[PDB]
Ligand binder design. Structure first.
Ligand SMILES: *c1ccc([N+](=O)[O-])cc1C(=O)Nc1ccccc1
Lengths: 262, 11
């Protein structure tokens, strides 16, 4: 069981973890420390209704400008994910167009994976950890805004119950990136060869790190299914928005908060 | 816009 092949998979897991820590300053451990009130370094202010929203002032249709703004604020995350992908052995040797295709689909799913770290069943961290926007306040907002985030909370609560740590997430994210079923991929085999090795490393990592969870490997692969559906649901959201006839005004502070989400 | 960002980051 402990042999050259398994040692190689442990070495790959460590390599990915080390690159993950270098690429992503916002780790899961840091987020959970804030959410469970462990960090006394300026604890986050809770925004739970319109009154606390205004007490919280510490921050071209409305919805479209929200999406423009969150996509612009996500540039740094996209750059971090791309930097991480360069560290995945074999990735930069793929055809450049396939590297771009892999990242152009993978980044959204990874952003949602990392957004889950900022979420619990009560709400989500915002303003670089200075605020906490409640789930039910978001859900209470007028259509179509009230439905924006709830499916991501539903995903995040289930995902977080797997209790993955940053060591786990490093490999999971690499597996997402090396998805050979992306539309428009030219050379699928060298991608699947890498992903197969990453999947072996993930299997071993979950066995060593999660004695409590039988079928965790399968459960985590099912989460990749839920991430894609969250991304594709954005196409439906855009159609809902265009067909909305009712007032879509939104408090400027709520627009700014939504630009911090995804 | 996204593809451009990724291509520049890959340089
Ligand atoms: C940005 C901010 C907030 C939301 N939201 O509350 O739904 C969405 C976005 C956004 O643009 N998300 C996105 C972009 C591209 C692909 C999937 C999802």
């Amino acid at each position: 069981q402990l042999n050259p092949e398994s040692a190689d998979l442990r070495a790959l897991a460590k390599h990915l973890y080390d690159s993950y820590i270098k690429s992503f300053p916002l780790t899961k451990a840091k987020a959970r420390a804030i959410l469970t009130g462990k960090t006394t370094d300026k604890s986050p202010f809770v925004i739970y209704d319109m009154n606390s929203l205004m007490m919280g002032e510490d921050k071209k249709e409305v919805a479209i400008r929200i999406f423009q703004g969150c996509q612009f604020r996500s540039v740094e995350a996209v750059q971090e994910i791309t930097e991480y992908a360069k560290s995945i052995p074999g990735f930069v040797n793929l055809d450049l167009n396939d590297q771009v295709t892999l990242l152009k689909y993978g980044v959204h799913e990874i952003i949602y994976t990392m957004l889950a770290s900022l979420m619990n069943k009560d709400g989500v961290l915002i303003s670089e950890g200075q605020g906490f926007m409640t789930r039910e306040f978001l859900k209470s907002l007028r259509k179509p805004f009230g439905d924006f985030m709830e499916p991501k909370f539903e995903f995040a609560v289930k995902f977080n119950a797997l209790e993955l740590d940053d060591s786990d997430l490093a490999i999971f994210i690499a597996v997402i990136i090396l998805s050979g079923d992306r539309p428009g991929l030219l050379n699928v085999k060298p991608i699947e060869d890498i992903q197969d090795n990453l999947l072996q490393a993930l299997e071993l990592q979950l066995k060593l790190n999660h004695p409590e969870s039988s079928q965790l490997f399968a459960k985590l692969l099912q989460k990749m299914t839920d991430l894609r559906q969250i991304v594709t649901e954005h196409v439906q959201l855009l159609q809902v928005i265009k067909k909305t006839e009712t007032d879509m005004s939104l408090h400027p502070l709520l627009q700014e908060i939504y630009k911090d989400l995804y | 816009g996204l593809e451009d960002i990724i291509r520049k980051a890959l340089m």
